[PDB]
Nucleic acid binder design. Sequence first.
RNA 1: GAUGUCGGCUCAUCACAUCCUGGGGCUGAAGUAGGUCCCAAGGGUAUGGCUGUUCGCCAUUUAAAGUGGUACGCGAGCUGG
RNA 2: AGCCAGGAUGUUGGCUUAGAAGCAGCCAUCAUUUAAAGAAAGCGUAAUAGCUCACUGGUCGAGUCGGCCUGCGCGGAAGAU
Lengths: 136, 176, 134, 38, 135, 94
Amino acid sequence: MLQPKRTKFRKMHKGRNRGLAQGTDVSFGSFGLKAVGRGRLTARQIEAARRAMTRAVKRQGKIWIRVFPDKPITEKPLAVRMGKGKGNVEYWVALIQPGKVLYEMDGVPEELAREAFKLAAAKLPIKTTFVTKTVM
Amino acid sequence: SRVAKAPVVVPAGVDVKINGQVITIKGKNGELTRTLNDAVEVKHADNTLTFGPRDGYADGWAQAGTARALLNSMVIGVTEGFTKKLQLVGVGYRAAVKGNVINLSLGFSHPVDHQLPAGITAECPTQTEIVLKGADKQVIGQVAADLRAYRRPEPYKGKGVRYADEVVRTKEAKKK
Amino acid sequence: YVKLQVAAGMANPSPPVGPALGQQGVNIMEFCKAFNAKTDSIEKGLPIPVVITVYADRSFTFVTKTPPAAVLLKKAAGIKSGSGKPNKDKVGKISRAQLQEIAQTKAADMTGADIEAMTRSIEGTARSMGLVVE
Amino acid sequence: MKVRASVKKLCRNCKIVKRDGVIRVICSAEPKHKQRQG
Amino acid sequence: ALNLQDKQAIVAEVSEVAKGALSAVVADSRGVTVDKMTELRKAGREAGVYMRVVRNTLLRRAVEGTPFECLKDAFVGPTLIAYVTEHPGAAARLFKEFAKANAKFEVKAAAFEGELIPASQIDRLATLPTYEEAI
Amino acid sequence: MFTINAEVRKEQGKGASRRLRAANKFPAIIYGGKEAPLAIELDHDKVMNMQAKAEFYSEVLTIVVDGKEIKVKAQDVQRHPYKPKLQHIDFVRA
RNA sequence: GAUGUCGGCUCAUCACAUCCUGGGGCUGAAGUAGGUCCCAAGGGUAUGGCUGUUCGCCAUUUAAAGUGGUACGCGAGCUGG
RNA sequence: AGCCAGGAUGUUGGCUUAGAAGCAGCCAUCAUUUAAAGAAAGCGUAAUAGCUCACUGGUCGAGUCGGCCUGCGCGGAAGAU
Ligand SMILES: [Mg+2]
Ligand SMILES: [Mg+2]
Ligand SMILES: [Mg+2]
Ligand SMILES: [Mg+2]
Ligand SMILES: [Mg+2]
Ligand SMILES: [Mg+2]
Ligand SMILES: [Mg+2]
Ligand SMILES: [Mg+2]
Ligand SMILES: [Mg+2]
Ligand SMILES: [Mg+2]
Ligand SMILES: [Zn+2]
């Protein structure tokens, strides 16, 4: 399960998730799983999808995870009123804008990479597309 | 489309009567009548029947294909005729014809008496065989289904009313 | 009609040939002695294949075939049992002169036209059992 | 009969048919493959 | 799937063997097991006969280059060719015995001298002996 | 030999570029040499099927701008964030 | 410048996510009996021991002893544990 | 697409197992006759058999296959007077 090893600060303002993605190209492998949607990926969703695609390629080839869940998410428990300080950190998300290449793969035939990515995509809360490496 | 474009050859001795959308096909084996869908334009000419779509109708070709198919089996009907063969499988299962009524013994308290419709005739060459004969392919098909319905082939012994050309897949009972 | 592989001078025990061919309708004492009388010329310690042709009157006629390809490669390399994992574990070695010896014997059953065609058909049986060509 | 949001062909003998505006999977080989979308 | 490169190669291989051979036998082979065929292939290679199953469209192409341009009307239904490259005859006799013993098929037509032989008159190339008989 | 047909851009900017893309066309630039850069428009479908071939990025292409022929080489490509579309192409005079 | 609270009694009314009865598909459905699901709301759907209890546990029934909404239905209707 | 025909040989590949003979598993996956036929995609046998597919020859006679950008629809869709 991915998570920052240490952080300058514990908690972070909600913020917004406007704009288009940076890192929209297959830069390490031969194939990629690109986000078409906008949303948050939790560390558990990222791991769930990583496990699915790894089992699929029978632990042959190489996998890259282009996303990192560095955003701390707080939550107020049940029977707790409003105020009295910001809630406690429970999980970590990665903000996802349309275009982000989430995962990359190489060392496997296109057909297999396509299936592995089909299996991982089902564990994600946002719409994805299969992408291939390009000459510029 | 590939079906509609293929012409139906009306043989010698077969009278075709077309009154708009109503077609009557008279032969040695009988006389059948059908009302074709408004989308169908049927042309006679020579010793053949040709079907095609009618302008303004969206599903014309699909309709003309069906119209063809029906008229082809109407022609076959009033000449050659159709034959469905059923065979009874299982202990005590027996059948007999008494005119237009098929008496069936199929393991029930009361014997089953099935009344045949106009044009379908039946004969039992064996106590375990029913042979249906008629001109209407749909009606013969219907009667064959209704007779099968009394006792549909069971999957553990193949017991029941089955078609002659029927493949009855059987299975083993739950182990223990 | 059944296919079996019985020893050169042995045909009678219950576990290998007993109720396997006897269940169809073949005489257990008539075939057992008629087979060993014809396979007497065949060398000791060599499984010889035989095909049975039975009719409606329980009668039988058999045609003896040449020893199997996976059988002759064991005596030529000097092994009793083959490799559990072929091409992953080497169990023996056979020369090019030994490959043509098995092929010249198998000529009566082989589909090949030339000597090189029958030799390559024995080369495949050797690779799929762990034996390497040396 | 399997009623579910996702109806698919499970084998080569499976066939997708639309009967009275309802997607169905009719299979000639396996009765277990019979599906209705709902 | 056969590509045009493959089709042109098959026309070439059967066009080369067309010139060289003396007597060619065209026959049907539908409803015959591989066991009986591998048996007629052993009986063919021995008698110096070339055995092949070629697409009738591909045959009307290898045969257009003369002298079998009369075997055209025999390229309707399953076609099997028997090209005798070594000594004329061999096949026309090998097929007649295989036809009678197996009862399946009928044997289409034979060719020799650049002339058409009908299905009834195949007794002409069946009674011919050796080369190798004149001595 | 890749031959690309192009018109000179009668307009420039955000508004005008977005209007081209809606019209199944895309802006592109030709620069390099002593010559002034030429702002051009390309048919989306045509260039899209061309760039599918690896040779497009290596070979010298010819751009046909109102009769005139211009030998160029694909310098840079701006692709759509997630769709299989082209946003803009940089062409350098060869 | 008052909208009486839990449970019981009495009397109910609707929903269907159906407990029983009815129809039906698959079953790792021989039969008997089950499992699962689809359709179906017409009617029907225990009495007691303990506890203020609702619930629950227990006893013995029954084809079944449904799940919910109705100011957690019902005190200008009763009770007052 | 449909329909006719074939789908062979070494060989029951080796190991394992009471048996594993394409079809429990494990490993290898060539070579021959070839029009083509995986040392075998599924069902079947105690193991064999038997049935069919991948592939190919014939018939037929002109279109056929499924990805991309897109418009509008369909299912997913159960609630209480
Ligand atoms: Mg209906
Ligand atoms: Mg603006
Ligand atoms: Mg007041
Ligand atoms: Mg319901
Ligand atoms: Mg369930
Ligand atoms: Mg009710
Ligand atoms: Mg008391
Ligand atoms: Mg009960
Ligand atoms: Mg209340
Ligand atoms: Mg009061
Ligand atoms: Zn199926």
